[PDB]
PDB file of C-alpha atoms and ligand atoms in Angstrom:
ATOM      1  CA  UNK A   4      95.036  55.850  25.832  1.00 32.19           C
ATOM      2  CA  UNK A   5      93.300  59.078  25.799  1.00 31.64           C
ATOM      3  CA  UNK A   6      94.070  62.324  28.244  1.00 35.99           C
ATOM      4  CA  UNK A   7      91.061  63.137  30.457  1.00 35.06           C
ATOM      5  CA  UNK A   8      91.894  66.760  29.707  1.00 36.50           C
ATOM      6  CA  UNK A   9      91.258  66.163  25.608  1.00 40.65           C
ATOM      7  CA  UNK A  10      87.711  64.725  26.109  1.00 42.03           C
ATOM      8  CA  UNK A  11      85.175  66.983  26.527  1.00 43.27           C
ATOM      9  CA  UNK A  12      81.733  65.581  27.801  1.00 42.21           C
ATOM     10  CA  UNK A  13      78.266  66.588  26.024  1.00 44.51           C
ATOM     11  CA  UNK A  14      74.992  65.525  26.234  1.00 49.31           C
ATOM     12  CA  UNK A  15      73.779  61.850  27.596  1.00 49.62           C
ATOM     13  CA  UNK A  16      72.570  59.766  24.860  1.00 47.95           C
ATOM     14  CA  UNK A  17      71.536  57.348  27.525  1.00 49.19           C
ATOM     15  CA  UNK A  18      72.265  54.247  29.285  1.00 50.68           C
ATOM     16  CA  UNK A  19      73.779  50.302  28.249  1.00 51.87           C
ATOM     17  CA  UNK A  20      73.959  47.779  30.559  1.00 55.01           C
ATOM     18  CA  UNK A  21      75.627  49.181  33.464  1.00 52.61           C
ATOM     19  CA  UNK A  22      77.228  52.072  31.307  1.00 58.35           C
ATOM     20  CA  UNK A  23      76.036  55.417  30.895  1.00 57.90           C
ATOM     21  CA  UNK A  24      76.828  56.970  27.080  1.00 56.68           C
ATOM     22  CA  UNK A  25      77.078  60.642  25.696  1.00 57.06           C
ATOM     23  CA  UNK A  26      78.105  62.514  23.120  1.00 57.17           C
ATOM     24  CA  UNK A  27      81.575  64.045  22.908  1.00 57.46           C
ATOM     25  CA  UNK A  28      84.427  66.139  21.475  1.00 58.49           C
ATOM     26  CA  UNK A  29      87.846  64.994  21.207  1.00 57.11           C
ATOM     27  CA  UNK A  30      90.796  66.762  20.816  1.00 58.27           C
ATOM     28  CA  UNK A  31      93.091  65.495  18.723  1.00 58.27           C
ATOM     29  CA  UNK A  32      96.830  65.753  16.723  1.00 56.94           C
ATOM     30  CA  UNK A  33      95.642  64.010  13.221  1.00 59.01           C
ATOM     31  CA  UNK A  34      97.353  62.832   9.856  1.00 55.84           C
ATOM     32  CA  UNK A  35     100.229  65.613   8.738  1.00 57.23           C
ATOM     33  CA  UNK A  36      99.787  67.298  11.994  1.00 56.63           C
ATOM     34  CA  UNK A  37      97.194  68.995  11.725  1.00 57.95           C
ATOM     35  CA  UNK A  38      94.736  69.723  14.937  1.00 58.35           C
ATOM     36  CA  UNK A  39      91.457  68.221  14.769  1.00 57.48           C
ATOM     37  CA  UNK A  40      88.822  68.491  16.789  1.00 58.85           C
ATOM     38  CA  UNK A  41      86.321  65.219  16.742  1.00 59.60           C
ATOM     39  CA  UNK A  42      82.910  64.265  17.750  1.00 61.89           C
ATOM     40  CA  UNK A  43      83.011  60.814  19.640  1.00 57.91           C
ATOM     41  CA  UNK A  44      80.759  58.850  21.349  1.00 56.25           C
ATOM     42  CA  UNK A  45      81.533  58.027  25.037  1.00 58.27           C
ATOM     43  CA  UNK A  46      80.767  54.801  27.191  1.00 57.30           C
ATOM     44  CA  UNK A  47      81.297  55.313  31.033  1.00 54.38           C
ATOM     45  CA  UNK A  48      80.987  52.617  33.231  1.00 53.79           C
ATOM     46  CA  UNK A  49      79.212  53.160  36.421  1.00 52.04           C
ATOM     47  CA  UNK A  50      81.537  53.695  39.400  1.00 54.31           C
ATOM     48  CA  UNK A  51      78.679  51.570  41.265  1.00 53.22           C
ATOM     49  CA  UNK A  52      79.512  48.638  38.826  1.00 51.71           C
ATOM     50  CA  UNK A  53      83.125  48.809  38.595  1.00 51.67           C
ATOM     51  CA  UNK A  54      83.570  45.373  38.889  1.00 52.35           C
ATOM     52  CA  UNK A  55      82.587  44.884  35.900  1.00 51.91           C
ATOM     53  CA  UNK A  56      85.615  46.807  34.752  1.00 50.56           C
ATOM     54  CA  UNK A  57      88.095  43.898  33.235  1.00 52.50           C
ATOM     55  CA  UNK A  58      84.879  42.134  31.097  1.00 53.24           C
ATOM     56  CA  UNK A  59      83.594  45.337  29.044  1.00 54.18           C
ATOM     57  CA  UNK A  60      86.987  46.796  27.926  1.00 58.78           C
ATOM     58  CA  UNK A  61      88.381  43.412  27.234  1.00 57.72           C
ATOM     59  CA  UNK A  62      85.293  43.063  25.127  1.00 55.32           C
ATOM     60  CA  UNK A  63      85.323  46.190  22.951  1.00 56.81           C
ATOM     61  CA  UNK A  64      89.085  45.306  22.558  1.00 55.51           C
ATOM     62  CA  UNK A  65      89.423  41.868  21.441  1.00 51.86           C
ATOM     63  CA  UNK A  66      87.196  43.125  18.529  1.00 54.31           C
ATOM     64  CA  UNK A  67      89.162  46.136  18.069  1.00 56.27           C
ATOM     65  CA  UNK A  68      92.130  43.951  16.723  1.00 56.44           C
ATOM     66  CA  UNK A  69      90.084  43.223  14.054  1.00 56.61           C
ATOM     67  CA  UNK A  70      89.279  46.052  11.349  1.00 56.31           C
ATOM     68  CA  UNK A  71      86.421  45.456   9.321  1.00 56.48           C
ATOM     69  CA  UNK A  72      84.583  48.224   7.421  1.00 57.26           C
ATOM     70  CA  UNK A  73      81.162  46.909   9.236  1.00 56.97           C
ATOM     71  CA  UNK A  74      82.694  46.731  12.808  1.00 58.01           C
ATOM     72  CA  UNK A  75      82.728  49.914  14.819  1.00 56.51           C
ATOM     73  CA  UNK A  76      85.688  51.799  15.124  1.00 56.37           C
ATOM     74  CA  UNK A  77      86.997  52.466  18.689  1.00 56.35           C
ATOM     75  CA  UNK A  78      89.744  55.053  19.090  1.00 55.61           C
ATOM     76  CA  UNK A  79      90.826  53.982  22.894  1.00 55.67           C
ATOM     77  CA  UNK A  80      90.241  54.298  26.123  1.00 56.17           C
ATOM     78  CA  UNK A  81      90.556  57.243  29.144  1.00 58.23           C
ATOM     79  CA  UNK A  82      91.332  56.206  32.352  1.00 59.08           C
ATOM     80  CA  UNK A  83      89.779  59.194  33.299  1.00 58.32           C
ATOM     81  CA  UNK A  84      90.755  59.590  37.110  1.00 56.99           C
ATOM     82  CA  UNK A  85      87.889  57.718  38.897  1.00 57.84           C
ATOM     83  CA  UNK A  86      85.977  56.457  35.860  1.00 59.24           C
ATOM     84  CA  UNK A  87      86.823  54.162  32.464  1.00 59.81           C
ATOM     85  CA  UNK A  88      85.858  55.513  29.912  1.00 57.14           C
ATOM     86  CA  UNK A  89      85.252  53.963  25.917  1.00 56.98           C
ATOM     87  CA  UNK A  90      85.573  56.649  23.253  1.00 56.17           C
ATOM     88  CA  UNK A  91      84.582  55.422  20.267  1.00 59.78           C
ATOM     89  CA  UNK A  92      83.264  57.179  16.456  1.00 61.61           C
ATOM     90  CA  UNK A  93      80.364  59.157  16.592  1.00 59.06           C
ATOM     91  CA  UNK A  94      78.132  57.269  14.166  1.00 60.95           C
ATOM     92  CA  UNK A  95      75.510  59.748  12.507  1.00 63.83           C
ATOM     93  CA  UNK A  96      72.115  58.091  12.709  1.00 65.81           C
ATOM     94  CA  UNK A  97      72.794  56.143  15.928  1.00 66.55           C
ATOM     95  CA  UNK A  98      71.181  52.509  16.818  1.00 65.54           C
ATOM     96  CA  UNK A  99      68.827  50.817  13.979  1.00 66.80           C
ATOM     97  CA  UNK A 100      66.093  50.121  16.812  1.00 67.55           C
ATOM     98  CA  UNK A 101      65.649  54.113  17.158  1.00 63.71           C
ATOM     99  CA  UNK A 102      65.589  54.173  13.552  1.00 65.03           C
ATOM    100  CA  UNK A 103      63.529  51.309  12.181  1.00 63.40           C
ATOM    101  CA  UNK A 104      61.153  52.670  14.835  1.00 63.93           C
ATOM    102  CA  UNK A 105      60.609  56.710  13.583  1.00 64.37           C
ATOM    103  CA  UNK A 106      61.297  55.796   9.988  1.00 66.83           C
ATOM    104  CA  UNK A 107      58.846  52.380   9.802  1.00 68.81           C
ATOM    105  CA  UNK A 108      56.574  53.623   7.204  1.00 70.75           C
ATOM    106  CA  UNK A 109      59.267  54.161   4.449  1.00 72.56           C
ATOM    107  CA  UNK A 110      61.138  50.679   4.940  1.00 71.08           C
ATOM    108  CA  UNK A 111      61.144  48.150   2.453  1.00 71.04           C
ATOM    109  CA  UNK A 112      62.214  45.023   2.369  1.00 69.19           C
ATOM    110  CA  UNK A 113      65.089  45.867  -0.292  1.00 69.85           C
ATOM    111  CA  UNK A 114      65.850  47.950   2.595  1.00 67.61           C
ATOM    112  CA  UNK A 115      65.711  45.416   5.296  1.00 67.40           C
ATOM    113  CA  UNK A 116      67.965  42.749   3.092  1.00 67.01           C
ATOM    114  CA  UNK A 117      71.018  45.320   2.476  1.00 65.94           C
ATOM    115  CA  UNK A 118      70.882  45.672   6.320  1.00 66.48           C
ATOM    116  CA  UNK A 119      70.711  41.849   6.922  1.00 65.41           C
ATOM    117  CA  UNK A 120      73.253  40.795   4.013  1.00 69.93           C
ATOM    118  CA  UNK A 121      75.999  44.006   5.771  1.00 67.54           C
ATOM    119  CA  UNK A 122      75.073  42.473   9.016  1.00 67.65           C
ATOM    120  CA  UNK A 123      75.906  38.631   8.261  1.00 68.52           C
ATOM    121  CA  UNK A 124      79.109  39.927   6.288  1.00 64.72           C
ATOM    122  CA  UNK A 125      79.966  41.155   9.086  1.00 66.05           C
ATOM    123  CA  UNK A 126      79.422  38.373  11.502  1.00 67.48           C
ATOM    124  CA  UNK A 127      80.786  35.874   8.885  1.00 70.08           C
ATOM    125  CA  UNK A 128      84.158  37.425   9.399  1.00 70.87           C
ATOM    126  CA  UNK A 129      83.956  37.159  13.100  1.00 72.62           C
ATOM    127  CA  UNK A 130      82.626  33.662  12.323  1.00 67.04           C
ATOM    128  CA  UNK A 131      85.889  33.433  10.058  1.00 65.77           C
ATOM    129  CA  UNK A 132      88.304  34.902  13.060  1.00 66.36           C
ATOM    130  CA  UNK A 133      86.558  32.331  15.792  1.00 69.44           C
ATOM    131  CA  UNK A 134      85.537  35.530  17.437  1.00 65.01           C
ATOM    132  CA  UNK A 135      82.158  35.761  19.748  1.00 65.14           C
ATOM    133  CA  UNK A 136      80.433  38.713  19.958  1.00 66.66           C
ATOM    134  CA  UNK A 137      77.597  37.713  22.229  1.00 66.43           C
ATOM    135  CA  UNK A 138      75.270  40.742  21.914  1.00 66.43           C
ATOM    136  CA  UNK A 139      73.587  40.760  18.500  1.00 64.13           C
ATOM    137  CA  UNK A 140      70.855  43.254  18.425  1.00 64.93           C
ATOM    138  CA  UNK A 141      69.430  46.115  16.785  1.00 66.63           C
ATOM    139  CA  UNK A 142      70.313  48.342  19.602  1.00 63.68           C
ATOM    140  CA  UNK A 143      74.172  47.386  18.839  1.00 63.21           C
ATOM    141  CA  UNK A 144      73.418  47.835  14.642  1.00 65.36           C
ATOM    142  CA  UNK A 145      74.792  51.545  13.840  1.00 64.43           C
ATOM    143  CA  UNK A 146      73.436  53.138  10.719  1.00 63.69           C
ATOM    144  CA  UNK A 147      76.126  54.858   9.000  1.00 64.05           C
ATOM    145  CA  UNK A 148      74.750  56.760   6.099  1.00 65.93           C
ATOM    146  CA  UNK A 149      70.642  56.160   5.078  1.00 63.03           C
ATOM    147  CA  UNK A 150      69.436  55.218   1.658  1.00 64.04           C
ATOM    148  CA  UNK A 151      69.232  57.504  -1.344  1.00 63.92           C
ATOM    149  CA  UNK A 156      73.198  53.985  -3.000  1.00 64.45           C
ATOM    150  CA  UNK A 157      72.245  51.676   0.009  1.00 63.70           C
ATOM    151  CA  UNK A 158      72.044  52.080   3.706  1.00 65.01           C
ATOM    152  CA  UNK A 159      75.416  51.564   5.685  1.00 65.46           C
ATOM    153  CA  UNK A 160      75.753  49.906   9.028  1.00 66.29           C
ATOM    154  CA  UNK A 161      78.359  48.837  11.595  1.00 66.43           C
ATOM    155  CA  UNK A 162      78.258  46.088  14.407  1.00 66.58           C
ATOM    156  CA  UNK A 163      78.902  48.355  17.618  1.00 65.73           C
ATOM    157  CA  UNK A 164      80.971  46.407  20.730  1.00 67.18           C
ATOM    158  CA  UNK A 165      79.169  43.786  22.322  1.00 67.39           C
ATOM    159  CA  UNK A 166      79.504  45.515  25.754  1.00 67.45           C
ATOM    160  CA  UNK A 167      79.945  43.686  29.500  1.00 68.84           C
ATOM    161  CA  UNK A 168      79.976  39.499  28.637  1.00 68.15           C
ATOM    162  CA  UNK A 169      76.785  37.534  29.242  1.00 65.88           C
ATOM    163  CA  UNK A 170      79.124  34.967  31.018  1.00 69.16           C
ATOM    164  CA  UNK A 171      79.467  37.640  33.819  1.00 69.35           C
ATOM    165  CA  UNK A 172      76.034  39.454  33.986  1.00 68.73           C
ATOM    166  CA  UNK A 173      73.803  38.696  36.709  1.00 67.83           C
ATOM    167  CA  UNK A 174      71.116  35.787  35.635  1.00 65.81           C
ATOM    168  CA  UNK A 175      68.330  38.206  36.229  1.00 68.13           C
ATOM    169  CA  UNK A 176      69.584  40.415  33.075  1.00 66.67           C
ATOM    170  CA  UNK A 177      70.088  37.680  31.325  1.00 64.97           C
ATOM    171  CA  UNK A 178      66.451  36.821  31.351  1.00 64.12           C
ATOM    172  CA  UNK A 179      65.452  39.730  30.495  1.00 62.86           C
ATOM    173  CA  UNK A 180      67.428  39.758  27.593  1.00 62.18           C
ATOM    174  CA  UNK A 181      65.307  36.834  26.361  1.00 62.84           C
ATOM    175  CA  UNK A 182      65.053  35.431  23.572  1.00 61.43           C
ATOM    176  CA  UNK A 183      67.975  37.445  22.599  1.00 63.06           C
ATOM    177  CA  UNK A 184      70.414  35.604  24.532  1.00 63.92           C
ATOM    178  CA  UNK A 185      70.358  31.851  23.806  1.00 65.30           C
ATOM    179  CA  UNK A 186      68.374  29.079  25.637  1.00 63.01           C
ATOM    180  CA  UNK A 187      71.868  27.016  26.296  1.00 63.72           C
ATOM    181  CA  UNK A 188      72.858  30.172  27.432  1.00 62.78           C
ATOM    182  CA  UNK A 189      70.187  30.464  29.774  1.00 60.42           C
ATOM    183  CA  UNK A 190      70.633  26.934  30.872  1.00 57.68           C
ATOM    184  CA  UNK A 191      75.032  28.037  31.500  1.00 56.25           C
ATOM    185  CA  UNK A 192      75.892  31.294  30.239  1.00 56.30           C
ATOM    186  CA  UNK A 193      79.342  29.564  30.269  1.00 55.11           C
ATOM    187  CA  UNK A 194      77.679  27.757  27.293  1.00 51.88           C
ATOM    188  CA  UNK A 195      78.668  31.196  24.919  1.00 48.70           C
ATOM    189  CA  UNK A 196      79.751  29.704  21.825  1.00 45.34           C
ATOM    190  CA  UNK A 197      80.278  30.818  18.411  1.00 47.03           C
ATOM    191  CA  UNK A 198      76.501  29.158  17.562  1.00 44.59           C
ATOM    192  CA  UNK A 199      74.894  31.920  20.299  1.00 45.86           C
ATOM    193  CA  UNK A 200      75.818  34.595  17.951  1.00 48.58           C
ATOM    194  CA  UNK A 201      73.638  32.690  14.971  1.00 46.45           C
ATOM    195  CA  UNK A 202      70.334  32.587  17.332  1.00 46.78           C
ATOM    196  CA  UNK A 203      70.849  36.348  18.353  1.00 47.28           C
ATOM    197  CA  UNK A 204      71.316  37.359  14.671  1.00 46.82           C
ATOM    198  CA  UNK A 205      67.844  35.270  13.628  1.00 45.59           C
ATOM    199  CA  UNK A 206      66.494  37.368  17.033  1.00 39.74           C
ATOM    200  CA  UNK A 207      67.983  40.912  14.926  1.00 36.69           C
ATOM    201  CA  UNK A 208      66.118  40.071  11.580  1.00 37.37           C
ATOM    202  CA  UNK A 209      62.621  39.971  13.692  1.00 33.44           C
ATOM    203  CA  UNK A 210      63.372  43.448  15.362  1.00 32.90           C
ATOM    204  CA  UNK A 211      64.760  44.565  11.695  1.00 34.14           C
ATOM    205  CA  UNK A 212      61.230  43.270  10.116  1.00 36.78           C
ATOM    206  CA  UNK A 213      59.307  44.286  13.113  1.00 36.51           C
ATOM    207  CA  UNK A 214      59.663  48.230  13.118  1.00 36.88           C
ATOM    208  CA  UNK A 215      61.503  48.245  16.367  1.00 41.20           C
ATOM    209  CA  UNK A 216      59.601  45.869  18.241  1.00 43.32           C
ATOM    210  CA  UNK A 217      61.097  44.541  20.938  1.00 41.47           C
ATOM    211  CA  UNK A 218      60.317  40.182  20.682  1.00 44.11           C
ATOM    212  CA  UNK A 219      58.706  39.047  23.925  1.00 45.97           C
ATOM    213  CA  UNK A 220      58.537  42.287  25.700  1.00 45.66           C
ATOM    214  CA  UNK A 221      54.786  41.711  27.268  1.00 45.86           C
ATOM    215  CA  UNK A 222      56.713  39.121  28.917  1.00 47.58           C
ATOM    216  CA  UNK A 223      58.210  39.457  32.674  1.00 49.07           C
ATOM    217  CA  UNK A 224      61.223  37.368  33.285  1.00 46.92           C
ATOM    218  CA  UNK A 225      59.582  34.498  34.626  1.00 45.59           C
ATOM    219  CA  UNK A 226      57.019  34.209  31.310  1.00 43.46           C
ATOM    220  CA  UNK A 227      60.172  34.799  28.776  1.00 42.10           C
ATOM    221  CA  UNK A 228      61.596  31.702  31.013  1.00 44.32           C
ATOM    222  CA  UNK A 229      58.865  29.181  30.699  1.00 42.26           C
ATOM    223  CA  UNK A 230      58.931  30.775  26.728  1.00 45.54           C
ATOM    224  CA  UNK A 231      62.220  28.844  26.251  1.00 47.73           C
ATOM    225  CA  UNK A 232      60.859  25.530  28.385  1.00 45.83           C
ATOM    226  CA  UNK A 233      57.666  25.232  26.102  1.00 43.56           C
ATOM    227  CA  UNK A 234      60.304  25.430  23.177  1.00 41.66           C
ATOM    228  CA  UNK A 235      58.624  28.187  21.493  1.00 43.63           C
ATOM    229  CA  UNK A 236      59.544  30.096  18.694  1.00 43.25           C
ATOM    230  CA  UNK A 237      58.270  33.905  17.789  1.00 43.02           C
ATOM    231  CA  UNK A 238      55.370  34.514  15.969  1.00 40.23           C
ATOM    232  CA  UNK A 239      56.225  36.028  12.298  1.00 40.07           C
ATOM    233  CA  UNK A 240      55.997  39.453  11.685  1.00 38.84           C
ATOM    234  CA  UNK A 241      53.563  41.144   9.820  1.00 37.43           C
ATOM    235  CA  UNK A 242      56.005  40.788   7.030  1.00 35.74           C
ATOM    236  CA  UNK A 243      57.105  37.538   7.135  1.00 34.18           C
ATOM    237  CA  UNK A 244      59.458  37.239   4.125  1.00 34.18           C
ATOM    238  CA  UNK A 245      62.564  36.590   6.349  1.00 33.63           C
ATOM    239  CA  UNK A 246      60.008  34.502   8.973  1.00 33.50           C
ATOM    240  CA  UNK A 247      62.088  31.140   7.783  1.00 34.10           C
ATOM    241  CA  UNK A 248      65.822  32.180   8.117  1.00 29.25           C
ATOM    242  CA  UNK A 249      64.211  33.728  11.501  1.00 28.92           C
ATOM    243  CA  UNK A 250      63.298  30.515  12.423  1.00 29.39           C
ATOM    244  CA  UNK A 251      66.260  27.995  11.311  1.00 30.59           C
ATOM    245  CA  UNK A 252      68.637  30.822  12.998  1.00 31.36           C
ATOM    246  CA  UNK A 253      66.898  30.440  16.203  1.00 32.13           C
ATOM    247  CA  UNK A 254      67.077  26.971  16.171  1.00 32.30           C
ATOM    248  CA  UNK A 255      67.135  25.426  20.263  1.00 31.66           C
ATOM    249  CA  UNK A 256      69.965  23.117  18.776  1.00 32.04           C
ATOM    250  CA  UNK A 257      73.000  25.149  18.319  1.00 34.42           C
ATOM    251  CA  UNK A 258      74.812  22.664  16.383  1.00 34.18           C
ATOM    252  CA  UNK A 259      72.074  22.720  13.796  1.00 31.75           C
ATOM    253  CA  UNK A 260      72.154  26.583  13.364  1.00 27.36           C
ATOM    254  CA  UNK A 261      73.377  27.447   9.896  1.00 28.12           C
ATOM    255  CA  UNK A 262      76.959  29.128   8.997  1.00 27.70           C
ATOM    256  CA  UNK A 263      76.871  32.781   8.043  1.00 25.68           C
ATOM    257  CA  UNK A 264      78.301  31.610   4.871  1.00 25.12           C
ATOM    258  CA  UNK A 265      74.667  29.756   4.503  1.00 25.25           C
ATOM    259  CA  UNK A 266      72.814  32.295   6.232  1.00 27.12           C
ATOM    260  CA  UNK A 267      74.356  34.578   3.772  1.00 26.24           C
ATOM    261  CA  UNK A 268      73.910  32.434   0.496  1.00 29.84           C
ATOM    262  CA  UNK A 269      70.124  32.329   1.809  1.00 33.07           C
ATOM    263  CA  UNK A 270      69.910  36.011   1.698  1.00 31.73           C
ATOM    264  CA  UNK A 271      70.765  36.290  -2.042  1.00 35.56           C
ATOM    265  CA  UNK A 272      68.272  34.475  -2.805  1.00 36.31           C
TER     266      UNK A 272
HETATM  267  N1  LIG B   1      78.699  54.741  18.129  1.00 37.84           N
HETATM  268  C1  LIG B   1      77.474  55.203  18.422  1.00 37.84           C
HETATM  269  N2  LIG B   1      77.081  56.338  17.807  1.00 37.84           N
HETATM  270  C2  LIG B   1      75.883  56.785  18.212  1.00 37.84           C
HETATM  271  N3  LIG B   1      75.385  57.879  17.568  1.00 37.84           N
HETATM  272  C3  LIG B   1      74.177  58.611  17.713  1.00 37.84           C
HETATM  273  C4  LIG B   1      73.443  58.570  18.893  1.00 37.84           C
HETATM  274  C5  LIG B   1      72.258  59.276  19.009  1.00 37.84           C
HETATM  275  C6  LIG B   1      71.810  60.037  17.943  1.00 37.84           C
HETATM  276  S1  LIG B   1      70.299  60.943  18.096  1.00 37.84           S
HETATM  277  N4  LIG B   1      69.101  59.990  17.643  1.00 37.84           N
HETATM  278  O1  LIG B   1      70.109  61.231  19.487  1.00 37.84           O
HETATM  279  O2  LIG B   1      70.350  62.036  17.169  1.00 37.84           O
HETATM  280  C7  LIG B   1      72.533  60.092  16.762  1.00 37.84           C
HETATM  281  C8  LIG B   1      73.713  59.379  16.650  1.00 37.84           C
HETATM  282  N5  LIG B   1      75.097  56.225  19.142  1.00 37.84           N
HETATM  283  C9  LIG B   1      75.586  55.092  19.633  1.00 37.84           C
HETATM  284  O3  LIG B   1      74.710  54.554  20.510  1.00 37.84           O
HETATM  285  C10 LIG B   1      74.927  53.324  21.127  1.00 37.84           C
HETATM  286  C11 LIG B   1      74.742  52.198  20.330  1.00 37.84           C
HETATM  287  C12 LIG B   1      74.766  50.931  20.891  1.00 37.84           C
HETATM  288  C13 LIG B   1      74.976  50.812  22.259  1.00 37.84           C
HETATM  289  N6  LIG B   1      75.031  49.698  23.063  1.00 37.84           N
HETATM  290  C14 LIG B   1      75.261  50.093  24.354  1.00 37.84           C
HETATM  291  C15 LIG B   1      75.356  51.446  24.415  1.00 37.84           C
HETATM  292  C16 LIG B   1      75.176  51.938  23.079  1.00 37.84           C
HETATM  293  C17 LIG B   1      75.155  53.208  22.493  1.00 37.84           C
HETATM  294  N7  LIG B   1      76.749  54.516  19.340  1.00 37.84           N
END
């Protein structure tokens, strides 16, 4: 529970899903005392969506009882007067979309499969924990430190829940958000996190592409009628474990334990 009058707002870094986030100091009493003085990034949900109030921050702290060194640290919240607010640590290279997009020509795929392996460790322990994140993308993969010793990434919060959004976002988050989904978003399970992670690898091997984006909402619907799949990149070598993680049975999707022992090899 942060004061309003130790945050100080910076520059937007642009918008989520009914949030608008920026760049931040915090002011802070630290370990032995000592005054620190912190960059942070800040989530603010719109005051024109503040019924969606309840869902986010009950989202970004359900994971927060869990520490994980590839789960995004949160430091609280600020009920700051009319506005709540997320402050959460400033992660140096920001989202992997960004990045796989402005650094595409110097990405490997020993590259791509220290990002995949961090990001099913990660989503094995949720997976462990019986914890759903229900937003899997590269926009919510945070890239640590970059290669020299391997890159490092964290799974950011999963944001407002896809069991409250409006069905019209939800199809436009095709094909990241599940067909059962589609069918009930009350369908979230613990297998909608397996298709959304088989949805990341494409983006990851695709340069920040964005999977089915020449589609309008109506086409990305009939996309999950016709029970198709994506095409495979360009470089396909992670075109299979794509394909069995976006599976349109969810029972037949693969454990991260699986997904994981499919990586090593
Ligand atoms: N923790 C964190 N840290 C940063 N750091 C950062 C941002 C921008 C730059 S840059 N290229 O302008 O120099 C550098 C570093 N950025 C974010 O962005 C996110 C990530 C996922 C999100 N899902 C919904 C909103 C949202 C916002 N989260």
């Amino acid at each position: 529970k942060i004061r309003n009058e130790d945050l100080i707002f910076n520059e937007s870094l642009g918008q989520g899903t009914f949030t608008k986030i920026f760049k931040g100091v915090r002011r802070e009493v630290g370990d032995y005392g000592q005054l620190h003085e912190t960059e942070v990034l800040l989530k603010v949900l719109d005051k024109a969506h503040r019924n969606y109030s309840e869902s986010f921050f009950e989202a970004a702290s359900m994971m927060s009882k869990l520490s994980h060194k590839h789960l995004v640290l949160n430091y609280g919240v600020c009920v700051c007067g009319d506005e709540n607010i997320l402050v959460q640590e400033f992660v140096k290279f920001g989202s992997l979309d960004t990045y796989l997009k402005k650094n595409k020509n110097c990405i490997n795929i020993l590259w791509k499969l220290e990002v995949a392996k961090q990001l099913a460790a990660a989503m094995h322990f949720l997976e462990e924990n019986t914890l759903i994140h229900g937003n899997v993308c590269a926009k919510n993969i945070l890239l640590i430190r970059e290669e020299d010793n391997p890159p490092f990434i964290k799974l950011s919060d999963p944001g407002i829940s896809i069991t409250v959004l409006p069905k019209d976002i939800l199809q436009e988050r095709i094909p990241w958000v599940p067909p059962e989904c589609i069918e009930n978003p009350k369908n979230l399970n613990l297998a909608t996190d397996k298709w959304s992670f088989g949805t990341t690898l494409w983006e990851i091997c695709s340069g920040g592409d964005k999977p089915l984006s020449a589609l309008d909402s109506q086409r990305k619907l009939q996309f999950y009628e016709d029970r198709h799949q994506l095409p495979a990149p360009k470089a396909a070598e992670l075109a299979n474990l794509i394909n069995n993680c976006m599976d349109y049975e969810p029972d037949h999707r693969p454990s991260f334990r699986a997904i994981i022992r499919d990586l090593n090899s």
